[PDB]
């Protein structure tokens, strides 16, 4: 009935915004620091927040966020015999205990290097992205509209050159997610072993090629991106930075990488970029495409959602952006002069697709 | 645990509500329903009924990319261009053929930019004593903002009013307590839709709708309803019986007791005030009664100082502090209650 569906439909905006607040308050890392199978109250978690130390009501407000995440199965919820038993019939215990789940373990920065899914999820729920989603209907109603352009007056990469906060949130979301994806690549794919040089075309701040050279130290690494990205990139061992425009000229390189680049652009733009890569490669060279591939038949699984999530984001964020099937990627490479397409499944829809010159 | 499994579970959370808002603004669910409520239809068939899309060759392919995410999330059925059909959830997004009622107006209010911009400041309520996320985002409190922002005033007022109609249809199936009333004052009654529906069912009730000037001045004329403007914290008009629906949950304990004492002073011996709210259950889980309370609990935490959902015991404590001497809680549906306070 209506008053069943109010719950199913009304929770949809609330859950992601409660999740974002919990990430910004460092809830998941604070729970982790109590140990392996920890179950801790809102007051114990708030005790570890110096910013809350003069707010008597902090824990009761925090509990209101955490109990929604518990109902949604993002946190586990429990109590103790002492809480049920010690106060007597006239005392009410309002505070339950919260623990991590398989999903919230992926929101804890790792002890060794700080990696997790936090930075990418803070980008996809950033106000710059949500404001673009508020204009999503314009793609259906208006020929050649782009929601990001309706919201902001500029396209995304040009906007990043003028807005240093957005530039940082985007660049860090790509870089930390990159580390997670390359750990999965290196478990399955052996095509880097024989290389002597790798050029990362649209390589962001250089994190991806930094990880490739760390694993394969005989590779000379080159990172190529727009001026406003290269100006903020760190110095990485074994990585040379190059600034420019991939649609005008790609540097010469023995092999090339395009990760999370083709999915932002329409077919003509993709073929133009791939022809620029072909001209700058030697005979025998290859370019590697790394993307979440759209399955031939969609269903209820991680591989399907891993493509549908960025398909909706790129529809909002850039003209022509979309996720593609194996056959659609093959068609782009073939149109640009490449041969011997080799699609390599990695994990949950993530592929390496090799294009040979 | 695998990072590249959990990317799917966590990354869809922001995407689903924003796809749902676009589909409601494009009237997708009503367009499917006009082929027949059991119909299965393609993105191109749906787009052919949107005059705004008629010079956009690419409209159906973009529409399909929105609808296939909703089909993967149980809001639409998908079958083999794929064909889309309604579900139990999306039938509640079709304006009724009889009167245009659905959940659309309330769902467009709780995902409105004014509300989402408040949720961007939600962490401030934990860190900073006495902060309110809406105030941090907008520079004024919500009812003051509505007085200077006509678009927001309309979205809020219409969300409350259309939701009110489906709530009172549930109330009238279970609760008989309006019979033999001769007069009812709706305190904080919005644009008056609630008291209009009570007088339609109980034609001997003289209905009075009471709210702030910026709400009353935009309210429609309803048969059997008189509108009065004022400030409920300063004084409430005399009335034989009163209603407080979705009012107490916006305010802290001291403000609630002040308002309830104003109501007590303006009631006769033998009068009652009715509280209508979604009541917080004693145990929370993955079920409609739990989420019906947790959704507005999170919204009012963001939107107004002191606002929160309450248990039956906590409502009783407020009525007793204001002088009321008999509390009768009446379950209606999925956590919604009528709670009578007797003078
Ligand atoms: N014309 C252009 N020339 C070079 N880089 C460009 C470009 N237009 C966009 N880009 C870059 O394309 C990248 C897309 S995001 C992906 C970054 C990285 N390859 C990763 O997988 O993490 C951004 O860093 C962006 O600045
Ligand atoms: N000081 C005050 N005096 C009277 N109305 C007030 C008020 N402060 C807030 N309100 C009103 O309280 C209402 C809360 S929203 C609920 C409206 C209606 N009772 C329903 O259930 O649909 C709004 O219409 C708002 O304008
Ligand atoms: C499965 O969940 C996700 C998967 C992916 C992304 C975000 C998710 O949450 C991001 C989103 C995104 C947005 C804009 C981009 O360029 C403008 C961009 O390259 C990417 C990369 N993709 C990689 C795939
Ligand atoms: C179960 O889903 C929902 C339940 C409820 C609301 C919205 C939902 O989506 C709205 C949200 C809301 C926000 C602000 C208010 O005053 C400032 C207000 O009275 C209400 C009313 N409540 C009624 C209960």
Swiss-Prot record, chain B:
GO terms for biological process: benzyl isoquinoline alkaloid biosynthetic process; methylation. The active site is at 249 (proton acceptor). Keywords: Alkaloid metabolism, Methyltransferase, S-adenosyl-L-methionine, Transferase. It is an enzyme of class 2 (transferase). Substrate binds at residues 106, 249-250. It comes from the Eukaryota. The keyword Methyltransferase applies. InterPro entries: COMT-like, O_MeTrfase_dom, Plant_O-MeTrfase_dimerisation, SAM-dependent_MTases_sf, WH-like_DNA-bd_sf, WH_DNA-bd_sf. The keyword Signal does not apply. Pathway: Alkaloid biosynthesis. It catalyses: (S)-scoulerine + S-adenosyl-L-methionine = (S)-tetrahydrocolumbamine + S-adenosyl-L-homocysteine + H(+); (S)-tetrahydrocolumbamine + S-adenosyl-L-methionine = (S)-tetrahydropalmatine + S-adenosyl-L-homocysteine + H(+); (S)-norreticuline + S-adenosyl-L-methionine = (S)-norcodamine + S-adenosyl-L-homocysteine + H(+); (S)-reticuline + S-adenosyl-L-methionine = (S)-codamine + S-adenosyl-L-homocysteine + H(+). Signal peptide: none annotated. Its EC number is 2.1.1.117, 2.1.1.-, 2.1.1.89. Highly expressed in capsules. Expressed is stems. Expressed at low levels in roots. One of its GO terms (molecular function) is protein dimerization activity. Methyltransferase involved in the biosynthesis of the benzylisoquinoline alkaloid noscapine. Catalyzes the conversion of (S)-scoulerine to (S)-tetrahydrocolumbamine. Can convert (S)-tetrahydrocolumbamine to tetrahydropalmatine. Can convert (S)-norreticuline to (S)-norcodamine. Can convert (S)-reticuline to (S)-codamine. Substrate preference is (S)-scoulerine > (S)-tetrahydrocolumbamine > (S)-norreticuline > (S)-reticuline. Homodimer. Belongs to the class I-like SAM-binding methyltransferase superfamily. Cation-independent O-methyltransferase family. COMT subfamily. This is Scoulerine-9-O-methyltransferase 1. The lineage of its organism: Eukaryota, Viridiplantae, Streptophyta, Embryophyta, Tracheophyta.
């Amino acid at each position: 009935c209506y008053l069943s569906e109010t719950a199913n439909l009304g929770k949809l905006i609330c859950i992601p915004m409660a999740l974002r607040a919990a990430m910004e308050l460092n809830v998941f890392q604070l729970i982790s620091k109590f140990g392996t199978d920890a179950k801790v109250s809102a007051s114990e978690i708030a005790s570890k927040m110096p910013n809350a130390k003069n707010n008597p009501e902090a824990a009761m407000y925090l509990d209101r966020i955490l109990r929604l995440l518990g109902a949604s199965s993002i946190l586990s919820v429990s109590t103790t015999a002492a809480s049920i038993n010690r106060g007597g019939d006239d005392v009410v215990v309002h505070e339950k205990l919260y623990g991590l789940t398989n999903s919230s373990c992926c929101l804890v920065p790792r002890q060794e290097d700080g990696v997790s899914l936090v930075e990418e999820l803070l980008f996809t729920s950033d106000k710059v992205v949500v404001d673009s989603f508020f204009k999503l209907k314009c793609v259906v109603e208006e020929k050649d509209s782009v929601p990001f352009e309706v919201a902001h007056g500029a396209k995304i990469f040009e906007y990043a050159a003028t807005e240093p906060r957005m530039n940082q949130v985007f660049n860090d979301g790509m870089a930390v997610f990159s580390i997670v994806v390359f750990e999965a690549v290196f478990r399955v794919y052996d095509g880097f072993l024989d290389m002597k040089e790798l050029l990362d075309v649209g390589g962001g701040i250089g994190t991806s090629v930094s990880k490739i050279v760390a694993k394969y130290p005989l590779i000379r690494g080159v990172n190529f991106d727009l001026p406003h990205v290269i100006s903020v990139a760190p110095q990485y061992p074994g990585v040379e930075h190059v600034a420019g425009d991939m649609f005008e000229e790609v540097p010469k390189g023995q092999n090339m990488l395009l990760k999370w680049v083709l999915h932002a652009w329409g077919d003509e733009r993709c073929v133009k970029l791939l022809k620029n890569c072909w001209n700058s490669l030697p005979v025998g060279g290859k370019v590697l495409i790394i993307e979440f591939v759209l399955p031939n038949e969609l269903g209820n699984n991680a591989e399907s959602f891993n493509a549908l999530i960025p398909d909706l984001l790129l529809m909002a964020l850039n003209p022509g952006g979309k996720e593609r099937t194996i056959s659609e990627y093959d068609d782009l490479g073939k149109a640009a002069g490449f041969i011997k397409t080799i699609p390599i499944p990695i994990s949950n829809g993530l592929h390496v697709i090799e294009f040979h010159k």
